[PDB]
Design an enzyme around this catalytic site. Structure first.
Site, PDB file in Angstrom:
ATOM      1  N   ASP A  34       0.903  -1.166   0.000  1.00 53.83           N
ATOM      2  CA  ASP A  34       0.000   0.000   0.000  1.00 53.83           C
ATOM      3  C   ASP A  34       0.930   1.201   0.000  1.00 53.83           C
ATOM      4  O   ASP A  34       1.540   1.495   1.049  1.00 53.83           O
ATOM      5  CB  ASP A  34      -0.782   0.074   1.319  1.00 53.83           C
ATOM      6  N   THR A  35       0.986   1.934  -1.105  1.00 57.78           N
ATOM      7  CA  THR A  35       1.679   3.238  -1.103  1.00 57.78           C
ATOM      8  C   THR A  35       0.686   4.294  -0.629  1.00 57.78           C
ATOM      9  O   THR A  35      -0.511   4.072  -0.721  1.00 57.78           O
ATOM     10  CB  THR A  35       2.190   3.590  -2.556  1.00 57.78           C
ATOM     11  N   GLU A  37      -1.687   7.479  -0.905  1.00 54.14           N
ATOM     12  CA  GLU A  37      -2.378   8.071  -2.037  1.00 54.14           C
ATOM     13  C   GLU A  37      -1.631   9.357  -2.350  1.00 54.14           C
ATOM     14  O   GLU A  37      -1.015   9.962  -1.452  1.00 54.14           O
ATOM     15  CB  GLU A  37      -3.861   8.369  -1.698  1.00 54.14           C
ATOM     16  N   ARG A  75      -8.929  -4.533 -11.801  1.00 51.09           N
ATOM     17  CA  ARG A  75      -7.448  -4.397 -11.851  1.00 51.09           C
ATOM     18  C   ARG A  75      -6.848  -5.779 -11.649  1.00 51.09           C
ATOM     19  O   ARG A  75      -7.236  -6.490 -10.703  1.00 51.09           O
ATOM     20  CB  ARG A  75      -6.930  -3.429 -10.772  1.00 51.09           C
TER      21      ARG A  75
END
EC number: 3.1.31.1
Length: 129
Positions: A34-35, A37, A75
């Site tokens: 999780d980068t 946002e 995705r």
């Protein structure tokens, strides 16, 4: 698991990229990371990191895990490699992503990623500063 060739179409943010995969464009979400946002702290840096890694690669590969291969938004859920180097681990090791919850059995590199994250954290690097 096996690697398949793909071609960058466009980097989107720290953990999403648009690839040509089997002759069609597809958005891929990187497994197990999780980068932030883009409008969060380290969001731009994570975006810039992933963009440079994939744009500068001579060869991009995608590697699905053993679980569900697409999310509910269409995705592709995969490990992505740029010249043989995983983007997923690179972002975590750089402290530009946290390791995410396992989604639907896709857990193959989970321990390897936790180990990279624990090192980033010990180094108080980026998100961990």
């Amino acid at each position: 698991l096996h690697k398949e060739p793909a071609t960058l179409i466009k980097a989107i943010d720290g953990d999403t990229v648009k690839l040509m995969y089997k002759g069609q464009p597809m958005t891929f979400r990187l497994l197990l990371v999780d980068t932030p946002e883009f409008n969060e702290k380290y969001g731009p840096e994570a975006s810039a990191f992933t963009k440079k890694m994939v744009e500068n690669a001579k060869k991009i590969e995608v590697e699905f895990d053993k679980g569900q291969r697409t999310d509910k938004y269409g995705r592709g859920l995969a490990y992505i490699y740029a010249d043989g180097k995983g983007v997923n681990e690179a972002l975590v090791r750089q402290g530009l992503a946290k390791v995410a919850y396992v989604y639907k059995g896709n857990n193959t590199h989970e321990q390897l990623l936790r180990k990279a994250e624990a090192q980033a954290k010990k180094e108080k690097l980026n998100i961990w500063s």
